[PDB]
Design a protein around this nucleic acid. Structure first.
Ligand code: MG
Ligand code: MG
Ligand code: MG
Ligand code: MG
Ligand code: MG
Ligand code: MG
Ligand code: MG
Ligand code: MG
Ligand code: MG
Ligand code: MG
Ligand code: MG
Ligand code: MG
Ligand code: MG
Ligand code: MG
Ligand code: MG
Ligand code: MG
Ligand code: MG
Ligand code: MG
Ligand code: MG
Ligand code: MG
Ligand code: MG
Ligand code: ZN
Ligand code: ZN
Lengths: 81, 151, 102, 225, 25, 129, 63
RNA sequence: CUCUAACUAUAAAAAUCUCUCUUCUC
RNA sequence: GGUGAAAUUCUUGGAUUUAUUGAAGACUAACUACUGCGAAAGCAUUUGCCAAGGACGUUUUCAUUAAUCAAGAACGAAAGUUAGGGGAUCGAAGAUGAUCAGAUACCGUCGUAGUCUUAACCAUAAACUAUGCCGACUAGGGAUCGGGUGGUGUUUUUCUUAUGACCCACUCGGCACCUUACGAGAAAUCAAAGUCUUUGGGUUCUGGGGGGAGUAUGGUCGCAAGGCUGAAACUUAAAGGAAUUG
């Protein structure tokens, strides 16, 4: 220790360090573009979703709330937004 | 890490990012956002669950970010802000729930203690709100006015 | 002064512990300052295993192992010699006493 | 202390001379149908022998009744119901481990779950049963301890209670014992609960018989033929 | 001499003098 | 079976006056009660291994007379509230029982261990010897 | 204790060196099979240094 | 660079005590 | 039975015992650890209902609502006091039985109130971590509890996913622990009791030598036990902390 770039830490250090503890607070979450096999509509779902979000066209609930990230419905296809 | 009425010292919170404008990938615009928010307002939902629904059901990061304005202020502009603010109303609901629990069974001395803490929180919050004059200066909660104010 | 950091209880953050009686002098001491032993021994002494073995049906009997937990007051623990008074810096060591049998 | 202040606020004979012998017979559920011998005073009217016999309960290790030493840590108790003459018939009355084994699988660094249950069997036998279960150190652990969560313990108890009730309410006591001897219920419980924990040493404890319908002597005759 | 028992004997003295108070009043 | 009539020993060995009381397989019928205190005088040694040993030899002799040759030995300490520990005599008693011709079988420990009952005698500071 | 002859004995038996230096990938099956980790370490060091790949089976059985 | 095993059981009573404390610099 | 030994005590109306039982009330052993929860007291069988709470996650909600707090409040072990209910055990008083010169004490056998409750008080503990609360920083290390992050990980198994379990790594908070001191302390010790003569982050409360004394007196709360508040006259050159050697 005794010398660091608190302005320029290694990106690995930032990734492992807790959020609100980095040089600038940066959320670890993101959004998801999710395709339900029911209808071809693509919906945006927050990673740590909270409500049992269903498709607007049909009752095909996509993400399930829990302590951590919303657990998906085993059938839908997701990409990171 | 104060945690008003508990020895707890955590920091479970949410850290909104550096950016203040909307994200580039956001295909929506302010107008549809405000119409949707106000539609939920007619649906009879408090601003908190409106925010969380817009965060999950849609790409709404934060209402201020994409609309330029804050949900309470938007509702006030459209005149659907509850006459009792969210947090005090929910504290009142919790207080009346605990009061019902205490009346239906007596010896819960520990539950009586936490009812006292709930009343203390209500008092402080109401004092702040009356300093900002959100609530009329005569407003006072003692036992049973809230028993109708919940309904 | 503080003879021990832990006060000898091993309570340190539990409010209060139920008391459990000493097995010899019936002293009431908290379950932590209730110096413990697991006396796993045979139901028949190792001295007389041969006589019991030769005069036994069910060849090579299991010969059960009697189990019981022993709770001493610390006064008994000093007198009944389960524990010994130790020198100052030797109070640090908390490990089992050097594996009696190995 | 041997001396007595002579307090008392010949007629000596050997009382065992007027005591005859009787033979214990186990039901057809067990394979060794002879148990041992019992001393009863000779059958004289106005307290006949069979008058005293009816109601006796005898404790015997299951290792003797099944031959194999695997049952060295089980113990059944049989009630005496009817006398055939110099040979008596018995029925299941209770079961329990020996205290040795019961203290054997209990150790530190593993929470034990007890699930009791009161049930009514197929015919009328009202019973109370116990189940003793232990969390298992997985064969990957570097964590020295193998505790369990309270919510998980509630789940385990719910599963065990459900399976116990399902078994007992369907069949009679005889088939209950017949499937109990190979402890197939142990394997069923661990199979149902395996997705929650490993949960080693599943066992069934203190099978306590509480109520019996009338006599059903025909069933006892079935168990002895 | 012993806080517990010096206190206890003082309590006994207080009780006796309170009985005397009751006698006088 | 090998014509062995199983008996039950049911040894009770407290800190005083060990007990050896052979009973039938039913347990309900009693045989040859003679205890430690019967075989010694001084009353200092009601529980002595020698008192227990004569008591066990006498019960074995009576078992020979009646005809019980195989015995199921049961060790029963004081248990319950009082010290839950085996006495100093019952071990010599069972050694004598095994020695005197009798064929042993199924030793077990039936000392009653309570689930937190009956705050026991001595006060709180306990026997202050 | 130690004297002149034992001194010389220690001296000679300490000067001892064996044949080919036991390293030089001569013993133990041409090229010391090692992990991917020191292999890519050498690669980042920028130097050829013959090698063979062997993943080290992260399991930590109690042994 | 490889290991997870046995062990014993003692507490009889013992109260009391008077002198007198006398120096450090090359 | 019982004890260092005995004796008081029960018993050929058969007690100690051996079995079945039934009874009431008590408590939840063994799991049970430098492990958990709660503000402290304290809380340990299971199931159902009741509300409550901490920590974690959050790109959700408002925008100083905050910290500590005279005055006032809610709890507060055990013992204790009223009344009503229980009445097993253990049991101050008492009765005894022993050692002893004395022993109305320790050891031993009975044993009233309490121990368990339901209402009403009492509000005192070595209520101890004898370390007030909220802030920020400073040093290495392992583990443990609760949550969450990733794992081409490992067994799991319903052919397989997915739980769950573990294993790895990281993070947040919690009881903590070990090492060292580069700092602190008079030290025993301390990772806070450090960042204090280089003296200042915000704060409430107590002490000014020891006896007198938490006593006298007056208020004040109480049915009472007593609790809170709280001196003086006089008296003494010490009492006291830690450590060292005998
Ligand atoms: Mg001391
Ligand atoms: Mg200790
Ligand atoms: Mg006494
Ligand atoms: Mg002593
Ligand atoms: Mg009798
Ligand atoms: Mg726990
Ligand atoms: Mg806490
Ligand atoms: Mg328990
Ligand atoms: Mg105050
Ligand atoms: Mg009463
Ligand atoms: Mg006397
Ligand atoms: Mg007395
Ligand atoms: Mg008594
Ligand atoms: Mg009380
Ligand atoms: Mg005080
Ligand atoms: Mg204090
Ligand atoms: Mg404090
Ligand atoms: Mg002073
Ligand atoms: Mg003072
Ligand atoms: Mg006064
Ligand atoms: Mg001193
Ligand atoms: Zn859809
Ligand atoms: Zn003791």
């Amino acid at each position: 220790v005794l010398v660091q770039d608190l302005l320029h830490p290694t990106a690995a250090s930032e990734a492992r360090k807790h959020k609100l503890k980095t040089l600038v607070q940066s959320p670890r979450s993101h959004f998801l573009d999710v395709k339900c096999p029911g209808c071809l509509n693509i919906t945006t779902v927050f990673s740590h979703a909270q409500t049992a979000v269903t498709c607007e066209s049909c009752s095909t609930v996509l993400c399930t709330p829990t302590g951590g990230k919303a657990k998906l419905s085993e059938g839908t296809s997701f990409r990171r937004k | 890490m104060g945690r008003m009425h508990s020895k707890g010292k955590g920091m479970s919170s949410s850290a909104i990012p550096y950016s203040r404008n909307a994200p580039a990938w956001f295909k929506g615009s302010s107008d549809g956002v405000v119409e949707q928010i106000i539609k939920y307002a007619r649906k009879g939902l408090t601003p908190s669950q409106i925010g969380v629904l817009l965060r999950d059901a849609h790409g709404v990061t934060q209402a201020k970010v994409i609309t330029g304005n804050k949900i309470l202020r938007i509702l006030k502009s459209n005149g659907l802000a509850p006459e009792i603010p969210e947090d005090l109303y929910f504290l009142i609901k919790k207080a009346v729930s605990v009061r019902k629990h205490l009346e239906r069974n007596r010896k819960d001395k520990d539950a009586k203690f936490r009812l006292i803490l709930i009343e203390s929180r209500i008092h402080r919050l109401a004092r702040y709100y009356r300093t900002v004059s959100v609530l009329p200066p005569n407003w006072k909660y003692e036992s049973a006015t809230a028993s109708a104010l919940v309904n | 002064p503080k003879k021990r950091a832990s006060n000898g209880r091993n309570k340190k953050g539990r409010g209060h512990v139920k008391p459990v009686r000493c097995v010899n002098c019936s002293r009431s001491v908290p379950k932590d300052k209730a110096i413990k032993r697991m006396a796993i021994r045979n139901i028949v002494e190792a001295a007389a295993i041969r006589d019991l073995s030769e005069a036994s049906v069910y060849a090579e009997y299991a010969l059960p192992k009697t189990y019981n937990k022993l709770h001493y007051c610390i006064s008994c623990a000093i007198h009944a010699r389960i524990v010994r008074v130790r020198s100052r810096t030797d109070r640090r060591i908390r490990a089992p006493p050097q594996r009696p049998r190995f | 202390a041997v001396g007595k202040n002579k307090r008392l606020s010949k007629r000596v004979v050997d009382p065992f001379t007027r005591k005859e012998w009787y033979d214990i017979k186990a039901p057809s559920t067990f394979e060794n149908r002879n148990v041992g011998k019992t001393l009863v005073n000779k059958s004289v009217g106005l307290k006949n022998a069979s008058d005293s016999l009816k109601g006796r309960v005898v404790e015997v290790c299951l290792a003797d009744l099944q031959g194999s030493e695997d049952h060295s840590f089980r113990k059944v108790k049989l009630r005496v119901d009817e006398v055939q003459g110099k040979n008596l018939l018995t029925n299941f009355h209770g079961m329990d481990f020996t205290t040795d084994k019961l203290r054997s699988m209990v150790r530190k660094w593993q929470t034990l779950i007890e699930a009791n249950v009161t049930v009514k069997t197929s015919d009328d036998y009202v019973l109370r049963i116990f189940a003793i279960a232990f969390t298992r150190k997985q064969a990957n652990q570097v964590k020295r301890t193998s505790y369990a969560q309270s919510s998980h313990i509630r789940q385990i108890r719910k599963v065990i209670s459900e399976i116990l009730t399902r078994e007992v309410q369907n069949s009679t006591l005889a088939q209950l014992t017949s499937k109990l001897i190979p402890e197939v219920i142990n394997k069923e419980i661990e199979n149902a609960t395996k997705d929650i924990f490993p949960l080693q040493n599943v066992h069934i404890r203190k099978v306590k018989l509480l109520k019996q319908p009338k006599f059903d002597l025909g069933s006892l005759l079935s168990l002895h033929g | 001499m012993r806080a517990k028992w010096r206190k206890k004997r003082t309590r006994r003295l207080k009780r006796k003098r309170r009985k005397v108070r009751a006698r006088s009043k | 079976d090998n014509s062995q009539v199983f008996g039950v020993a049911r040894i009770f060995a407290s800190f005083n006056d060990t007990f050896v009381h052979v009973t039938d397989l039913s347990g309900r019928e009693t045989i040859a009660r003679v205890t430690g205190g019967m075989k010694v005088k001084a009353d200092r040694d009601e529980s002595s291994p020698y008192a227990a040993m004569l008591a066990a030899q006498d019960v074995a002799a009576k078992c020979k007379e009646v005809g019980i040759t195989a015995v199921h030995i049961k060790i029963r300490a004081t248990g319950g509230t009082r010290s839950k520990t085996p006495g100093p005599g019952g071990q010599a008693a069972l050694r004598a029982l095994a020695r005197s011709g009798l064929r042993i079988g199924r030793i077990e420990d039936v000392t009653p261990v309570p689930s937190d009952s009956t705050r026991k005698k001595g006060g709180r500071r306990g026997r202050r010897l | 204790i130690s004297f002149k002859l034992q001194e010389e004995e220690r001296e000679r038996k300490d000067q001892y060196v064996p044949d080919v230096s036991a390293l030089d990938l001569s013993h133990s099956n041409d090229v010391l099979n090692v992990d991917t980790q020191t292999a890519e370490l050498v690669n980042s060091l920028g130097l050829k240094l013959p090698l063979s790949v062997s993943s080290v089976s992260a399991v930590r059985d109690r042994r």
